[PDB]
RNA sequence: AUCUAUAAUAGCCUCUC
RNA sequence: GACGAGGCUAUU
């Protein structure tokens, strides 16, 4: 009962239930209003002082002293030059040598906030090279399929990089 | 501890061994001929 | 909470959980809420906090 | 040793009404903080490639040349030693509940000093700082 | 103005230049005149370290021409300034752990083996011996300081390490450059004192923009006029 | 009076029909 | 094919 338009920027068929219709019985309803959001974080604020500047400038220290390395303390992330998933270390490297190859060097000054500057000039460039995996198959009679990887390079546009970039990979638990 | 710095790791070890070398030839560690032989590979490094 | 109840009155506790929890909650509130908390913060800092809740409302 | 130079008392059977506290889990002869403590290490380890000589170490400068007295010839892999020096040096504080006794040489025997309805009387070998008596 | 300092110091020394205005955080662009000092200053450091070589002896001797290679194995100084914090403080702190002398407090310009000692080399617009003072202030006998100066000044610290013949071409090095810089009308490029607060930037490109745009509740056509809304508005009741 | 301070990996527990 | 956060634990 919201807002539904096409993206511009991907294409895709986009809901948006804020400020939305008021509910009229008691299903589960996505529509919050913005007013009463606000209300409720003006009455926070009032309530404690000083709290959400506090928090702001603590986090915003915390930012301006972390390192790109913060990023491979995760586990199984999604790989976009793969499509795949692959662990955190391993997807990050993958990423700053794709950029490596597309003119992002923001990682080499070892700071997250250069490296995040590199993602949002990268969904900026009309099209990425990267380094991707490719499988080889051969026949050994039992006939069984052996795979055979390998990295071969690989170019995709700006569209397609975007989707990629926006990507939830799912899986069961 | 995790190592810091914005330079290449080949630039950091080429410096660092060479101040094991000299130190180890000022110290008495290293000898003539192989003080010679490391300089000249870090040299062509 | 003891403690502070209004004497003669009565206290009652609800256990509750929120059904739905991730499919109603929507990335554009959380953006509304990143911009009201860092209203005091340099345009950097309040960019950088958007950008996750942007990223979100435009996932695949 | 601390463990086998212990008395135990007798074990009574009662109410025990416990309060969680933040609490020293392990006895330290000398305690810092984990910054000071890793400066600490590097400069007894790895006194090459520790950077900046910070003040905060001025204090522990002594320390650090006796521990590098012990360690002069020693052949075990140095990450093992920085972490027994932080075995040594960092402390470990965890919330736990306790009832009348929160100094470390009790929270080690915790597990056997009360439970909910019984206690435990128990007699910790080794010295007792004066400010804790 | 950046053409001066490519044509008269080298490629190494500008990148070094640049390699230490980043570790600082300070922009090339925004501030030209600090980057040419600090090539100078680097450049007098390579120049007192290119005047000796230590010998099988263990004694220094000058250079010249007609010389190979490998007679020069081990400079009399070794160079500080010039190279990554990380790799200057490794050097400093073997140099002080292997000649059994405490670490300065301050990372050195240069370190002399002859005499073991860390040489923190300056360069003074004003008077040299102010300048000889206010870096005494820090650490006085710890690290022995030499002062050079554009008006043919110098303050050597106590214990000499160096011959006229040296001090002579660092300081008509100097004079040249002085001269060179005068006639190509770049000394008032340098004198300005322009430093206004620079702080970290985080820029928001087209693709974001425009997602973020997109990204805001109904009724708002833009994200600007969202902020503005949670910014100035007042939701009570 | 523990407030501070705190590298990395892995495990267990808790937190859509 | 097995994510995020919190706590605790072990190890280097
Ligand atoms: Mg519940």
Known sequence: ?????????????????????????????????????????DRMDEEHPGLFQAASQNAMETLMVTTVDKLTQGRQTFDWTVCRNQPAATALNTTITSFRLNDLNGADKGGLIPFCQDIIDSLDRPEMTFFSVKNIKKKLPAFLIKRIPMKVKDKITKVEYIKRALSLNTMTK | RKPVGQHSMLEAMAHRLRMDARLDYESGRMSKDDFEKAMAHLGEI | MLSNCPPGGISMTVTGDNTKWNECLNPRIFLAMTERITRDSPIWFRDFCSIAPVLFSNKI | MRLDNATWGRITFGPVERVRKRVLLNPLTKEMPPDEASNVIMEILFPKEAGIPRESTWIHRELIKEKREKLKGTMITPIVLAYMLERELVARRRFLPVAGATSAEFIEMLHCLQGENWRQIYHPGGNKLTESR | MDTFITRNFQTTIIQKAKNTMAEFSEDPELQPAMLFNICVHLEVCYVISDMNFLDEEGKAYTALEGQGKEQNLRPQYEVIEGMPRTIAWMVQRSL????????????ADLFDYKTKRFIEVGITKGLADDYFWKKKEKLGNSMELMIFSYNQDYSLSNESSLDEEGKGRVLSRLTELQAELSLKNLWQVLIGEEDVEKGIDFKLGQTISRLRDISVPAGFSNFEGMRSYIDNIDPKG
């Open chain 1, 1 to 41: 009962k919201g807002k539904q338009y096409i993206s511009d920027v991907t294409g895709c068929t986009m809901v948006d239930p804020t400020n939305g219709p008021l509910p009229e019985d008691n299903e589960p309803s996505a529509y919050a209003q913005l007013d009463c959001v606000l209300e409720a974080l």
């Open chain 5, 96 to 107: 002080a752990q292997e000649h059994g002398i405490e670490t300065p407090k301050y990372l």
